[PDB]
Amino acid sequence: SPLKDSLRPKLSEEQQHIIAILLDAHHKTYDPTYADFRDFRPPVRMSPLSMLPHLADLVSYSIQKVIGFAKMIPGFRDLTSDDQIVLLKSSAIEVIMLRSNQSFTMDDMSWDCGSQDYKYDVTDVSKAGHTLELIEPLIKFQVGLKKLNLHEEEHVLLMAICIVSPDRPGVQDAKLVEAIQDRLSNTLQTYIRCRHPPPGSHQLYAKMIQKLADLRSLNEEHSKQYRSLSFQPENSMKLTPLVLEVFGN
Amino acid sequence: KNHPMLMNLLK
Numbered sequence: 001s002p003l004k005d006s007l008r009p010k011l012s013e014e015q016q017h018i019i020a021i022l023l024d025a026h027h028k029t030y031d032p033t034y035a036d037f038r039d040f041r042p043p044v045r046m047s048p049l050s051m052l053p054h055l056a057d058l059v060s061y062s063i064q065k066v067i068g069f070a071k072m073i074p075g076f077r078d079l080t081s082d083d084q085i086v087l088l089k090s091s092a093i094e095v096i097m098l099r100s101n102q103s104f105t106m107d108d109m110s111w112d113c114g115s116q117d118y119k120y121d122v123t124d125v126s127k128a129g130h131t132l133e134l135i136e137p138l139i140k141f142q143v144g145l146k147k148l149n150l151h152e153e154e155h156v157l158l159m160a161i162c163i164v165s166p167d168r169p170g171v172q173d174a175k176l177v178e179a180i181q182d183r184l185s186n187t188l189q190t191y192i193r194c195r196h197p198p199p200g201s202h203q204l205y206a207k208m209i210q211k212l213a214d215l216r217s218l219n220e221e222h223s224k225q226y227r228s229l230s231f232q233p234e235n236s237m238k239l240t241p242l243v244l245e246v247f248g249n
Numbered sequence: 250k251n252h253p254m255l256m257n258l259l260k
C-alpha cells in the first residue's frame with residue numbers, strides 16, 4: 001500500500017545533497033597525506049612535556065580545519081555569530097577526537113600520520129597524565145569507532161551533528177540549533193536505513209549517538225587536564241594563539 | 250565573546 005510505503009521514506013534529494021556537501025567539505029578540510037605536519041614544531045621524544053609544542057601545533061591546525069568544515073554544514077551560517085562561536089568552542093576538541101579516527105590504526109593502536117615521527121601512540125599522549133580519565137578512554141573510543149566501521153557519509157554526518165548541538169553551554173538560539181541538528185540527524189537515520197546493510201546497521205544510529213555522549217565525557221576530562229596544565233604559564237606559553245582563544249586561558 | 254581569530258576564520 002502507498003500508506004505503508006510512506007512510512008519507510010527513501011533518502012530525499014535534499015538529504016542526498018546534504019551528504020554531498022558534507023563530503024565535499026570534509027575532503028577540502030582533511031588532507032590524508034598530512035603534508036602540513038612538516039610545518040609544525042618538531043616532535044621531541046628523546047621534560048616529559050617535550051611533545052607539547054608539536055601537539056599544540058597539531059591541535060591548533062586541526063581547530064582551523066574543523067572551523068572550515070563547520071562553516072560548510074547546511075544551516076550553520078544562519079546562526080548568529082555568537083552561537084557559531086559558542087558551538088565551535090564547545091565542540092572543537094570532540095570533533096578533533098572524532099576526525100582523528102581516520103588516522104587511527106588498530107594494528108598498533110596509534111594515530112599514524114604517515115611518518116614514524118608523526119605516529120602517536122599511548123606513551124606519547126599519556127605524558128601529561130590523566131591516563132585513566134582521558135587517554136585510555138580516548139583510545140577505547142577510537143577502537144569502538146573502528147568497530148562501527150562507518151561509511152564516510154556517516155562519519156561526516158556525525159561530525160556535523162556533534163558541532164550543531166543545542167545543549168552546549170552559552171547557546172542563545174537553542175531552537176534554531178535544534179532544528180539544524182534534526183535535519184542532519186534525520187539524514188543520518190535515513191541514510192543508515194537505506195544504505196547500510198545488516199548486520200552492521202543494527203542499532204547503528206543509537207550507537208553513534210552513544211559515541212557523542214562519550215565525547216562529552218572526553219571533552220570534560222580534557223578540559224580538566226587543560227586547566228591544570230595552563231595554570232602554569234610556562235605551559236600556556238608553548239601553546240598557540242588560536243588554542244588559547246578557543247579553549248580559554 | 251572576543252574571539253577575533255575564530256571570528257576571522259568564520260568569515
Ligand SMILES: C=C1[C@H](O)CC(=C/C=C2\CCC[C@]3(C)[C@@H]([C@H](C)CCCC(O)(Cc4ccccc4)Cc4ccccc4)CC[C@@H]23)C[C@H]1O
Binds near residue numbers: 050096
Ligand atoms: C588531522 C588529524 C589527524 O587525524 C591527526 C590527529 C590526531 C589527534 C590526536 C592524536 C594525538 C593526541 C590527541 C591530540 C589528543 C589529546 C589532546 C592529547 C592531550 C594533549 C595535552 O592536553 C596538551 C595539549 C593541550 C591543548 C592543546 C594541545 C595539546 C596534554 C599532553 C601534553 C604533552 C604530551 C602529551 C599530552 C586528542 C586528539 C588526539 C588530529 C586530526 O585532526
